[PDB]
A paper describes a structure:
HvExoI releases a single Glc from non-reducing termini of oligo- and polymeric β-d-glucosides to support seed germination and plant development. HvExoI folds in an (α/β)8 barrel (domain 1) and an (α/β)6 sandwich (domain 2) that at their interface cradle a 13 Å-deep pocket- or crater-shaped active site. A vital conclusion drawn from the structural studies with the native β-d-glucan glucohydrolase, isoenzyme ExoI (HvExoI) isolated from barley seedlings, was that the glucose (Glc) product released from β-d-glucoside substrates remains entrapped in the enzyme active site until an incoming substrate binds, presumably lowering the energy barrier to facilitate Glc displacement. We discover that through chemical signalling, the incoming substrate evokes the formation of an autonomous and transient lateral cavity that serves as a conduit for the Glc product displacement from the active site.
Here, we capitalise on the Glc product entrapment observation in native HvExoI isolated from seedlings, which renders it an archetype model to examine product/substrate dissociations/associations in a pocket-shaped active site. When we first described the HvExoI structure, we were unable to explain why the trapped Glc product remained bound in the active site and has not diffused away, and what was the implication of this unassuming observation. When we first detected the Glc product entrapment in native HvExoI, we hypothesised that the role of Glc may be linked to the pre-organised state of the active site to maintain efficient catalysis required for the growth of a plant embryo.
Author numbering: 1 to 602
């Protein structure tokens, strides 16, 4: 007879209910299971009725794989899922958090902290739009973004993933969501999931909640704050996310007052689901349920019970799916987890899948492949990088000539520093590899290449990675541009109690600026100890992690555009002051939140 769930003209809620009523326990638990492409095979996907796949950081089909290679991979998995009895399409997720950043040749946008510097939500919406297109270029339908953490301590390894220490700025930047997913209809019910169709992707507000509030910025640790503080600082942007129809929410590894977020029924069910009326699906973080226990994974049976009873809908396993499925099945057969809980998880997963059009377009569109790295998107990334730059100093004394903007025509100029010609360094973490990497890892333009592309043909450009003082004094240079800063990092590898840049960095700046007027470009995920760099430099720019389009930097250095970025975080005098945020009783910054010098276009 007629099968209502397969009928594209029927309302989503009717299709969900029709399909849910047909499913076995195995088919239901399958929908709740998300696995790594690394453990996926056609038989695994078919036999376990798997609901979702992901690529973790650096999980790619081949080094340098084309958009088509990605589409073929995703479609191979989909074909297996579509061959099950009910033919429920899988959804494939990835960390597309500054562009489609795992993919070779994808446009890499500035990381979130630099976007916060722009104070430009429409720019961020446009970045969401371009990112959706590059993700769909690779056949992927689901991006684990935006990170709406409000980072309250820059010692956190993920501080660069947070738009600001100020929740109001994070709130405004939730415009990423309708960029990724499309604008919701007039009349939209807050908390319903939304994706416009096959040219958009499902978004994910993460990581719920207080991931940016942990003690001493220790990643995955305890956020110790009263309910009023949680609701005033860490929660607000989730409500903007509900209003904008975010499709999914990912749970944080962190704890709130000692309770694991992955086990917190009060917040996940009581608050997110029952108060905010969230109707999309709630996903774990990677091995998030394993980490409820200490040691992690020491009581996986408890991990499954605690997380599923808390209200999580989809588990990012991501590897040991057999153990997950077996344990969850046993809990349901034993009456420990009720069928109502399973039915709720599956209703939410199917709701997102039907809403986004996945049953109508389960396969990739080969005509989208050319969206990857498209020049228009690179032009956008270049605009964003330029807008993100914060000018901290432009002259050593109030009476010096301003150094910036620099002249494009000069006899001889010097470009120097470990970050001047290093694409990997300028992109930072979550670029190609999970932790990012060094050197030419993708298609882009380094600061050195941007300088050579910008200057008059008569300008001789000399590159020296780490010149000594005599080299500079003898070189006959008009000025120097020196780029230094942090190496790429992600998650706990970025936790850092000293916040001092690696050497050589300061030593290079001192050698260069001691011999010729210099503009220092600081590449970092966060404020770092900066007084010695300032003391040496004529001009200093905080460029954050500007991504693949290094011409964004030189657009401002050479005065094609004026500097406009403003600090989205407090710049501390000393790490012993931390945590120290705008509005604090004792607020003694080196530069306040909102500080930024300006220039005018030449
Ligand atoms: C402030 O605190 C931070 C965080 O705790 C700390 O930085 C970390 O230091 C660790 C050692 O103390 C280091 O762990 C080791 O890393 C070895 C390899 O490290 C290189 O490659 C990784 C990526 O694979 C980078 O992240 C590192 O920055 C480092 O990169 C190299 O750095 C040199 C010097 O600038 C450069 O010339 C190279 O080109 C560059 N290489 C690359 C590929 O980019 C590893 O093999 C060891 O087994 C060990 O695990 C850890 O990586 C680092 N984390 C970072 C930077 O995010 C600071 O202390 C050190 O800084 C490093 C760079 C080094 O110079 C140490 O001697 C410093 O003490 C702390 N600062 C202080 C205490 O003043
Ligand atoms: C030389 O540089 C000056 C400093 O940048 C610049 O004056 C600024 O111009 C900008 C852009 O027009 C002004 O921003 C606006 O401020 C409004 C009032 O609050 C906002 O409602 C606007 O939205 C806009 O704010 C920006 O929105 C985007 C976001 O990303 C930014 O962070 C945010 O600032 C800004 O207030 C001016 N600042 C000051 C101190 O005056 C000069 O531009 C002048 O000439 C033109 C371009 C015109 O816009 C004038 O109003 C402006 O004063 C610039 N001079 C020249 C000759 O180019
Ligand atoms: C926040 O971070 C702190 C610091 O990492 C966490 O405390 C640490 O927890 C680990 C257990 O995961 C402890 O390691 C264990 O130590 C015992 C010795 O007592 C040893 O026998 C075990 O094999 C294991 O290595 C570690 O000592 C401990 N450190 C401190 C200073 O307490 C803390 O649990 C984190 N909090 C949250 C909510 O995540
Ligand atoms: O080390 C590889 C894996 O580690 C995980 O903890 C990261 O979150 C994944 O993105 C990554 O694929
Ligand atoms: O790679 C999937 C997930 O891995 C986790 O380790 C990170 O915390 C998330 O930000 C990421 O989306």
């Amino acid at each position: 007879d007629y099968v209502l769930y397969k009928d594209a003209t029927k309302p989503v809620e009717d299709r969900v209910a029709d399909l849910l009523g047909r499913m076995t326990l195995a088919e239901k638990i399958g929908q709740m299971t998300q696995i790594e492409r690394l453990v996926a095979t056609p038989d695994v996907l078919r036999d376990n009725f798997i609901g979702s796949l992901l690529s973790g950081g650096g999980s790619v089909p081949r080094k340098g794989a084309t958009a088509k290679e990605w589409q073929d991979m995703v479609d191979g998995f989909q074909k297996a899922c579509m061959s099950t009895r009910l033919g429920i399409p899988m959804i494939y997720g990835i960390d597309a958090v500054h562009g489609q950043n795992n993919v070779y040749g994808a446009t890499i946008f500035p990381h979130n902290v630099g976007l916060g510097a722009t104070r430009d939500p429409y720019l961020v919406k446009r970045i969401g739009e371009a990112t959706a297109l590059e993700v769909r270029a690779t056949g992927i339908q689901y991006a684990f973004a935006p990170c709406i953490a409000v980072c309250r301590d820059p010692r956190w390894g993920r501080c660069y993933e947070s738009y600001s220490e100020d929740r109001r700025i994070v709130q405004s930047m939730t415009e990423l969501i309708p960029g990724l997913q499309g604008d919701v209809p007039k009349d939209f019910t807050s908390g319903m999931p939304f994706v416009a169709g096959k040219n958009k992707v499902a978004a994910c507000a993460k990581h719920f909640v207080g991931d940016g509030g942990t003690v001493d910025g220790i990643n995955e640790n305890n956020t110790i704050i009263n309910r009023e503080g949680l609701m005033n600082i860490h929660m607000p942007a989730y409500k903007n996310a509900m209003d904008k129809g975010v499709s999914t929410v990912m749970i944080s590894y962190s704890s709130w007052n000692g309770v694991k977020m992955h086990a917190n029924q009060d917040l996940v069910t009581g608050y997110l689901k029952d108060t905010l009326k969230f109707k999309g699906f709630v996903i774990s973080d990677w091995e998030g349920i394993d980490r409820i226990t200490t040691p992690a994974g020491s009581d996986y049976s408890y991990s499954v019970k605690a997380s599923i009873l808390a209200g999580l809908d989809m588990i990012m396993v991501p590897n040991k799916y057999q153990q997950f499925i077996s344990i969850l099945t046993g809990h349901v057969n034993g009456g420990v987890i009720p069928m109502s809980r399973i039915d709720d998880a599956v209703t939410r997963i199917l709701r997102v899948k039907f809403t986004m059009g996945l049953f109508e377009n389960p396969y990739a569109d080969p005509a989208m492949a050319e969206q990857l790295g498209k020049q228009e998107h690179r032009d956008l990334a270049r605009e964003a990088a330029r807008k993100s730059l914060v000018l901290l100093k432009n002259g050593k004394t109030s009476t010096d000539a301003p150094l910036l903007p620099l002249p494009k025509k000069a006899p001889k100029i010097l470009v120097a520093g470990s970050h001047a010609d290093n694409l990997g360094y300028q992109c930072g973490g979550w670029t190609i590899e999970w932790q990012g990497d060094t050197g030419r890892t993708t298609v882009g333009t380094t600061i050195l290449e941007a300088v050579k592309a910008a200057v008059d043909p008569s300008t001789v450009v000399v590159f020296a990675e780490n010149p000594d003082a005599e080299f500079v004094k003898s070189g006959g240079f008009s000025y120097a541009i020196v780029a230094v800063g942090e190496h790429p990092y992600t998650e706990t590898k970025g936790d850092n109690l000293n916040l001092t840049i690696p050497e050589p960095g300061l030593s290079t700046v001192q050698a260069v600026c001691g011999g010729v007027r210099c503009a220092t470009v600081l590449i970092s995920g966060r404020p770092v100890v900066v007084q010695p760099l300032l003391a040496a430099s004529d001009a200093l720019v905080a460029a954050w992690l500007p991504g693949s389009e290094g011409q964004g930097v030189t657009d401002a250095l050479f005065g094609d555009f004026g500097f406009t970025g403003r600090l989205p975080r407090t710049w501390f005098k000393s790490v012993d002051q931390l945590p120290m945020n705008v509005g604090d009783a004792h607020y003694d910054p080196l530069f306040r939140l909102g500080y930024g010098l300006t220039t005018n276009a030449t």
